[PDB]
Amino acid sequence: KFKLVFLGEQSVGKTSLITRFMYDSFDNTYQATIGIDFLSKTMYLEDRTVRLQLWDTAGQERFRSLIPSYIRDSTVAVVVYDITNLNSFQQTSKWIDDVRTERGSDVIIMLVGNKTDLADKRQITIEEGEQRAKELSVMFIETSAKTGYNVKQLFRRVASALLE
Numbered sequence: 001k002f003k004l005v006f007l008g009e010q011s012v013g014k015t016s017l018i019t020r021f022m023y024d025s026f027d028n029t030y031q032a033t034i035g036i037d038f039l040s041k042t043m044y045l046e047d048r049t050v051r052l053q054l055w056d057t058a059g060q061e062r063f064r065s066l067i068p069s070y071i072r073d074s075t076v077a078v079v080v081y082d083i084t085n086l087n088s089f090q091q092t093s094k095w096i097d098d099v100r101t102e103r104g105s106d107v108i109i110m111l112v113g114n115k116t117d118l119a120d121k122r123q124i125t126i127e128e129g130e131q132r133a134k135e136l137s138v139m140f141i142e143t144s145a146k147t148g149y150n151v152k153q154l155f156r157r158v159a160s161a162l163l164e
C-alpha cells in the first residue's frame with residue numbers, strides 16, 4: 001500500500017510539491033488548504049508501475065485534530081519545512097513525533113527542505129537537515145516546487161523505499 005501523507009507548518013510548500021508532481025505546474029499565489037484533500041497518481045519505477053495515494057493536510061491549528069487518523073493510515077509521511085523559515089524546521093520535530101506516535105517504526109518518513117530556490121534567505125543548511133534526518137532515522141531531500149528541483153526524485157525515493 002502506497003499512501004503518502006504530507007505534514008508541515010502552513011506555507012512550507014506541501015500543496016505545491018504535490019501539484020508539481022501531479023501536473024508539473026506551480027502557482028506563485030498562495031491557496032491555503034482546507035481540511036485534508038486526496039489525490040492519486042500512478043508513477044513508473046523499477047520496471048513496474050505504482051499507484052500512489054496522496055493526502056494533503058492543512059497546517060492551520062484548527063484542522064489539527066483531523067490529522068492523526070490520516071497519519072495512522074499512511075505508509076509514508078512526508079514532513080516538509082521551508083529552508084528559509086527556522087520555525088518551520090523546528091516544528092518538524094512535532095510532526096515526526098506525531099508520526100512515530102501513530103506508526104512507530106512501521107512507516108517510511110521523508111524529511112523535506114523545500115524552497116531551495118530562495119538561496120539568499122536560507123536559514124537551515126543542507127547539512128543541518130541531513131544530520132537531523134540521520135539522527136531521527138528518517139530519509140532526507142531538499143526541493144523547490146517552484147523550479148521543480150528534485151521533486152520527481154522525492155517521489156521516486158519514497159516509492160523505491162516502499163517497494164523495498
Ligand SMILES: Nc1nc2c(ncn2[C@@H]2O[C@H](COP(=O)(O)OP(=O)(O)O)[C@@H](O)[C@H]2O)c(=O)[nH]1
Nearest residue numbers: 011012013014015016027028030115144145146
Ligand atoms: N519560492 C518558492 N516558493 C514556494 C515553493 N513552494 C511553495 N512556495 C510558495 O509558498 C506559498 C505556500 O505554498 P503552499 O504549497 O500553499 O504550502 P502549504 O501551506 O504547505 O500547502 C505559496 O505562495 C507557494 O507558491 C518553493 O519551492 N519556492
Ligand SMILES: [Mg+2]
Nearest residue numbers: 014015032033
Ligand atoms: Mg496546502
